[PDB]
Amino acid sequence: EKQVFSRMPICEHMTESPDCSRIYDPVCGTDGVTYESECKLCLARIENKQDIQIVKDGEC
Template structure:
């Protein structure tokens, strides 16, 4: 019984321990013109704009030379 409770608590902590607060997008190795995948996995930028995915946010950061963070996964 103790192990079941421990397992349930561990699973709950795992799912609740997502990224909190704004974080840097993963733009490692990106420079110049890039082709982003067309998968729709929206992210909300710290500038209030929803980007189709993290790659599009990285491209915008490179083109405008601005430090935009990801505020949350999903639309703004």
């Protein structure tokens, strides 16, 4: 099932945050593609407007 047992990726741009401090941190999305940083997963989620969740930490 995975799905419910996901991590919700944190999706905003805090005031107090410049870069996604090159936080290298891969995850596997519910879409089933790897994203290289939870931030970038969220960024993609926002740009595309999707309900991606982290299925698990690290690559697919």
